[model samples]
Target chain A: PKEMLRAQTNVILLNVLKQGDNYVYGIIKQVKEASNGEMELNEATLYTIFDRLEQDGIISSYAGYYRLTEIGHENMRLAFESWSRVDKIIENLEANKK
Target chain B: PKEMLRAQTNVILLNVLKQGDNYVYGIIKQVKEASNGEMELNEATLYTIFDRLEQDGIISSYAGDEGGRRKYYRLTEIGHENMRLAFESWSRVDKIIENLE
Candidate 1:
């Protein structure tokens, strides 16, 4: 299967919103930086995320800028929760390797 | 955007069939070994794959002790074609690492 970082994408999106209202280009830059330029997320993926989040009312865009709604904040919190759980599992496995 | 290793699942499934007709437990064992036992695939995922493959006619399961305890799978010809394409795609990307250089 495609280990394409689908879950990681949401984490990155949330992190960018935490930085404040941003344009699409800004989000793109942040994603690239956070992923260390390793993830080559195409326009389709970015916009799809934007559209989905917007539809979920987790995010809102206006005046060429995107900002997190209250729901978006909640979503971010949930994303972090999920991410932390996954991280802990990885940490446990890594410790075992040591 | 699930990042659930959908493509990797197919690759792992193919590798198992490559080993010849295998029961559910054998496939699970191979998946565990190949993933270093980290995947933790549930029964749902395993059977879902089995059901889907059988429906697509890419894999056929039969016989056993007949209690459904040891259903075995054999791949169809088209299944081989799908796996080869996926492997080639990965190979191209990995080669860019140029480790020997």
Candidate 2:
């Protein structure tokens, strides 16, 4: 659960990548809408995450838009793989009795 | 994301209650198994959540077999409602993830 932040970061990055090129405000709006308001990331946090990802070479800013680098795409794949595992586990739990 | 701990606690308690009667160890085991080892809660943290739930009247603890060494927990009405809300939020997040390109 504590690792939720990391997972969420992956989700955000992947979304951004899927969008081709995007800005912080647009990313925030998309995430909030997609999550049904469950993931209301503020501008500061978005900026911080973007900054960190850029520094780590997962993303780069171009023409005022953020785009995923090659490394970022690879990380996004790995992140989804991790999520798939967790999703499977949840399915197993739901199928079994208490 | 930082609030995930609270959401996880709700999931644990609700899932335990859904099982009828369960102890701390069993709850921990179930959670770890269900999460595919992604969620390995510490004893201290689990106890803290349990204590808080009991204090908040969301769950009630009872003595199990083995001379009361084992404690069981069940959900109150409020707990059930909270669990419902947690599941709703979880599903919403799941939907977003699923919709991602």
Candidate 3:
């Protein structure tokens, strides 16, 4: 489930930064606050995501604050689409829980 | 990205098997069909999943009808419970997704 946490981390990071530029801890804070503590992202993994997003040109940082780019917007939309599909799949799968 | 695909496979495999017993190609077909081809899980990874799932005791495999040489899998009690728990815990992940929306 580390990968789920990691996958969720990357997606939420994009979602958090979609609103405005935010520092590292702030990005982490937004997810914690948004999920009501149901989710927690590791600091190490958060930084690694920052590195990946920046390196991939989806996001960039300034003075320790990270901001999304045009590419990031496209990727964000794609991420949401992927999540939507998985969500439907989960919904269908839940029926089998019976 | 493949990370998304990778992240989804475990749950899909478990979910696919939850409905009933199945083999590797069957699982792959169900996932791709369910996701409308938006998702694609390869052989190596799915084979690895079967091994790991079996080792974890969530699933146990059996040989198919004699002369078939193919293997099939069914969920153990723990696997059933795990899928239920996974469904329950998924609310948190869904929460994050909704908050973003």
Candidate 4:
């Protein structure tokens, strides 16, 4: 329904982490604020996203606060590029608008 | 992060549906044909997206006039507005990525 990069929540969270390190709850707040409340990141979502990123080594934490590791930075580039790739892929779809 | 494709998938579907009415299998075939078979839009995923779009009133569906179970769909007025907004957001995200290191 709300198609405007709402799928970019993960990327957005990583970008938020890039600004600085943050605790899990704090990270959620930053995403919501950043999206002007359009992207609400509650604790459940926060954990799922954070856990996946951490497992992939794209996100690392120290003293209970999460930040982008070197791997995280690398993956962010991958994420951004991959998301951009979506634009490329979509262009291939012929829209026979009439 | 992994579901980045779903994000793109949603956009691609909306764009396709905007063009004309089609059933799930036809939509899948169109995507596969367009991408030279590099992509596949399965019926499972298509149903999920269709359910959401229709639930949100961004799209609608009705039985095809001369088909058994092939339901066709097209965008509503709100759907167009959402697409317009999504395009702007796409540009915004493009800029955000550019600003990234």
Highest lDDT scorer:
3
User: What TM-score does each prediction get for chain A alone?
Assistant: 0.69, 0.69, 0.73, 0.67
Q: DockQ values for all predictions?
A: 0.05, 0.24, 0.34, 0.24
- Interface RMSD computed for candidate 3 is what? 4.2
Worst 10 residues of 1 chain B by lDDT: B92-101
Q: Candidate 4: which docking quality band?
A: acceptable
lDDT of 4 by residue, A1-98 (tens): 34334455666677777888878777666665555565555676566667877887878778849878887788667866766666665666654232
lDDT of each: 0.64, 0.70, 0.75, 0.72
Positional deviation of residue A1's Cα in model 3 after best superposition, in angstroms:
3.8
**Over the stretch A10-37, how does candidate 2's per-residue lDDT look in tens digits?**
6655675666687778777777776668
Collision pairs in model 4: none
Which scores higher on DockQ, 3 or 4? 3
Q: B1-101, model 3: which lDDT tens digit per residue?
A: 77656656776777787777888887777777777677778889888878888899989998887547788899999999877766666666667757756
Itemize residue pairs with steric clashes in candidate 2.
none
Which regions of candidate 1 deviate over 4 angstroms?
A: A1-98, B1-3, B65-69, B96-101
CAPRI-style grade of the A/B interface in model 1: incorrect
For model 2, how does the per-residue alpha-carbon lDDT over B1-101 read when each residue is reduced to its tens digit? 33544654655556756767778778778888777677777888878888888999989887767745788888888887866775675566667866554
DockQ of 4: 0.24
Model 3 residue A71 CA deviation in Å? 2.1
- lDDT for each residue of candidate 1 in B1-96, tens digit (9 for 90 to 100): 254355446556666676577787666655555445666667678888788888987788877675556767888888877667655654433332
Best by DockQ: 3
**Candidate 2, which segments miss by more than 4 Å at Cα?**
A1-13, A24-49, A52-58, A69-79, B1-14, B28-60, B65-69, B76-78, B97-101
